[PDB]
Symmetry: D2
Subunit: 258 residues, 4 copies
Amino acid sequence: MKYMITSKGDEKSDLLRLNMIAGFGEYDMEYDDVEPEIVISIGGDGTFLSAFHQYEERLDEIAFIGIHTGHLGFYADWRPAEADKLVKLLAYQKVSYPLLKTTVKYGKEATYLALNESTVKSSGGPFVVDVVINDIHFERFRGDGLCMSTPSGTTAYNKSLGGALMHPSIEAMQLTEMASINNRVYRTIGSPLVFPKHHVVSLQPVNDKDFQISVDHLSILHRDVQEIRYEVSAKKIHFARFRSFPFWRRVHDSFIED
Amino acid sequence: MKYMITSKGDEKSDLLRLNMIAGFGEYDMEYDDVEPEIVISIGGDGTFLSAFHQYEERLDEIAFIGIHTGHLGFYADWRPAEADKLVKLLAYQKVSYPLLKTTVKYGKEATYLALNESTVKSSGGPFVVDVVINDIHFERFRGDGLCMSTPSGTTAYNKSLGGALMHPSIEAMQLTEMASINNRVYRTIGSPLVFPKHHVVSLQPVNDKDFQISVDHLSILHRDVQEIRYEVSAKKIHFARFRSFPFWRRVHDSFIED
Amino acid sequence: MKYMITSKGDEKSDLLRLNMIAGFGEYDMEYDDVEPEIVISIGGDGTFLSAFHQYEERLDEIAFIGIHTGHLGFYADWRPAEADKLVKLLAYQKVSYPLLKTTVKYGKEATYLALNESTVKSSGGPFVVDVVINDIHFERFRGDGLCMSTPSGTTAYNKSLGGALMHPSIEAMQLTEMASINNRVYRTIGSPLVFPKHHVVSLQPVNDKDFQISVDHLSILHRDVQEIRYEVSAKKIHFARFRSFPFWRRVHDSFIED
Amino acid sequence: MKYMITSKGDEKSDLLRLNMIAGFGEYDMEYDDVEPEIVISIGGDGTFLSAFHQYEERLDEIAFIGIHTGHLGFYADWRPAEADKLVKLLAYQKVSYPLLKTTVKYGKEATYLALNESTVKSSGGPFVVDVVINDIHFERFRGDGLCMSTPSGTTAYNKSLGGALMHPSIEAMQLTEMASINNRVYRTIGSPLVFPKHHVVSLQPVNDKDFQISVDHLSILHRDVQEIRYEVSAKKIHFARFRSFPFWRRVHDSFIED
Ligand SMILES: Nc1ncnc2[nH]c(C#CCOC[C@H]3O[C@@H](n4cnc5c(N)ncnc54)[C@H](O)[C@@H]3O)nc12
Ligand SMILES: Nc1ncnc2[nH]c(C#CCOC[C@H]3O[C@@H](n4cnc5c(N)ncnc54)[C@H](O)[C@@H]3O)nc12
Ligand SMILES: Nc1ncnc2[nH]c(C#CCOC[C@H]3O[C@@H](n4cnc5c(N)ncnc54)[C@H](O)[C@@H]3O)nc12
Ligand SMILES: Nc1ncnc2[nH]c(C#CCOC[C@H]3O[C@@H](n4cnc5c(N)ncnc54)[C@H](O)[C@@H]3O)nc12
């Protein structure tokens, strides 16, 4: 079975990567980073996020595996001391988490796929957008920006914005506000919004048409923006599962105690 | 077709009720409040909540209809001026919203069904419970109480507690905190938690075993409490639908502008 | 110099109390709990709160001292291992913290003095009050209740309600909301309000006239309530200071790390 | 008495400015924008903010006056229909609001004066700073940024960040967080912090030394930053007062109803 391994780049991650490859050499496993069937990420959630977008065009043939070189992450689910036990079993069950689709239309169009969330901010100055939910005008937002998050991404940026922690078995997307201006004239919903499948959220500019759009770790300035469209993607990221590590248990170890 | 009508009790609600009955007398409609197939509530969301628990034991044979005597509610979806148009069509499609099941075990057991939310508070003094998610200990909560809400109930008590507005097509339940004590020794998740189907949340007492449990509008003191169990119910409330009134549009008219 | 010592009541607090008394017997110190000049509290912040209201009628002749039997409190500023060092020095400087005055008028009048905060809730059912700031109607509050807090009490109940941590050298009082109902028809300020000296906040009933008013740890039902009046008191609690323990350092050790 | 008038630049603001000048021509009033004693701003709070920093070097000889061309602002306190009544009286009492001092030290030093607030953000990538309160390390902040606000500025950016509304008679400054990263390893206070006079808050870089610092409406990138120092300034902005317009009344008309 084809596979590949990404490393955080430090001394501990590179050495653990070469030992797993040496262990895989004792089996019928071929290292191929062009079309692998198992992608192993060694580092942090950002290392896993980089490995996700590195193979986002081949998501239905790949089962991802995360190993945290430092503290426990949400996508990294294996301590470095449990690595030799992995390559053995890797020679299991597959669970799937929802993904967020982001479409940007200018005056072509660009689609994006996010594992954590997608964020829109102002290219300097004020940020004003008309929030449109299923072609119905819902509100005109004024503030710093908005954040549409995946279920697994609710524990990341979505959590710091007052959002709710959502179990990754629910196919949905959550929208949160960033310091919304609310007075007598300007009115936002304030509460986070959770959208089911096939529901389309559209952001439309009022005056400024340039926005600093971010998709997971990446963030690029988009000029002449006509519409930013959010919707739950039909693609799902597949994880390679070898035991029981519940999401709530994983939430407990990251924010409560471990 | 059998039917019945509940009234808020004021002068405007009673007169509108008698006119609909008089209109139903011009059709093949029999008024029966023992086993109706269409339950019409005229008043507010509390009037609809009272009509729900009045017929919670016959939920799969009944399609509910709400008419707001005052401001627009979330379960009341018809202005009084559109009442004659209702009895005509009532002689349509049925949509279903999820419901929350609450089990209370003492030292028998009592089950409850909530349309909005279920809340646990302390019978005087401090409130401490061990939150258990799927038999795994998640946290020990200290504060004023907790609130497990239905999707349609997210716009009610859940919204005022910082919770997220959840679309009623998603079968889930949301838990929120009420002034959680968080210091160096006491640690809660803080963020609201959204649980899918078949996920069981269990509250367990630490010292005090008496709690003021509320299920929608009702609130009764329970003594010698051993476990409070929350889970998405297999029963669903059925609404009688005659046109398009989206949930987000309904949210817009209630909190943004109308 | 006259003095007295209060104990939490457990085994560790009582033994430490008798050793300090034995140590005070080696000096010119007289134990008198009727009119002491130094009040020592051994236990927690609640033990100190009980010792405060035990001598709230003689606040300008007394310097309070706190010793935490368990974890560090905000009013308890001495570990039990530093007790012998206290009675020696106690045979120093005095700092003063602001206090909150609460006046309740019925259909007489009752005044109260709070070290942490004062809270108003509904005697069952809904809670609605008209908030009046300096005889001007500011808002009509709907929800669970309100909380007027002292500067030193901002780290207690005020903190869990989203309030701001206020330095105890500022003579002010902070008001916070408890799950305020906010829609298109009902509108609260939402943000916490910080009132200077001589500013009077008045709560007035709309329909229900019975409220569960709490002043620090105590909470009693008041019937036939006409007005609840909040204002910064002219009385100040005096602490006996023997070294430097800044408030922000004290905040750091309680919520960040210690 | 010398005076000058600033205009928002639109058609309504310029015409009202020329009519007041024509009215001032009927009195012993000299228009001088180099060293005026009365500065009149016609437009919005941003127009007043621009007029403040236009004369921030002569703050003790000037009494500011605000006229809102559109909706009511917090610094604009006069409707355009009450303009002729102003120039008459302007030929009164002076109230003073606190100001925030911001010192930036590099590897010289730059001081700033803010009427609303001062904000620090990351020059791309992550934002990490060590918060130091009176030379004591209080926390290491991770997130989007921080916001130190003046009392009168608490209703602006500070309000949207969950901060508390502070009366402008209290000489203090309030600090708020912007989506703080809080897990098991990273810990912030979360609650807003209110600092009295002579208290110094210092932000220190950890890795990145470039920050996008903003002082009221202005925002400029600062490179090679060694320390960002916040403290309540000894300078106070003086307002020209002709009647009673309480701050809480002014808060009521802006966020509740008007
Ligand atoms: N899924 C997860 N659960 C718990 N922790 C996690 N860390 C990560 C990660 C990572 C790698 O870098 C890119 C990430 O920077 C995050 N981020 C930016 N600003 C903030 C903030 N102010 N507060 C929390 N996050 C923030 C985005 O969300 C994006 O994901 N993912 C998760
Ligand atoms: N679904 C809905 N969406 C928008 N508004 C609604 N009102 C109602 C109603 C009703 C009838 O009385 C019982 C209700 O009192 C609510 N409640 C208590 N305390 C609060 C609070 N502090 N903040 C918001 N609610 C509160 C409970 O939630 C329960 O439902 N239902 C909805
Ligand atoms: N000053 C302080 N700083 C940091 N911790 C402190 N603990 C105490 C104490 C004590 C003794 O019992 C009475 C106290 O119960 C508190 N309380 C009630 N409900 C909550 C809640 N939901 N969240 C935080 N507090 C709460 C009140 O505020 C009151 O003071 N004082 C402080
Ligand atoms: N004092 C006031 N009270 C009530 N409203 C006010 N508007 C103003 C003004 C103005 C002119 O432009 C610069 C201002 O942009 C504000 N700002 C940026 N981002 C936000 C946000 N996300 N939420 C609220 N504000 C924001 C800053 O605070 C700064 O002041 N001042 C006030």
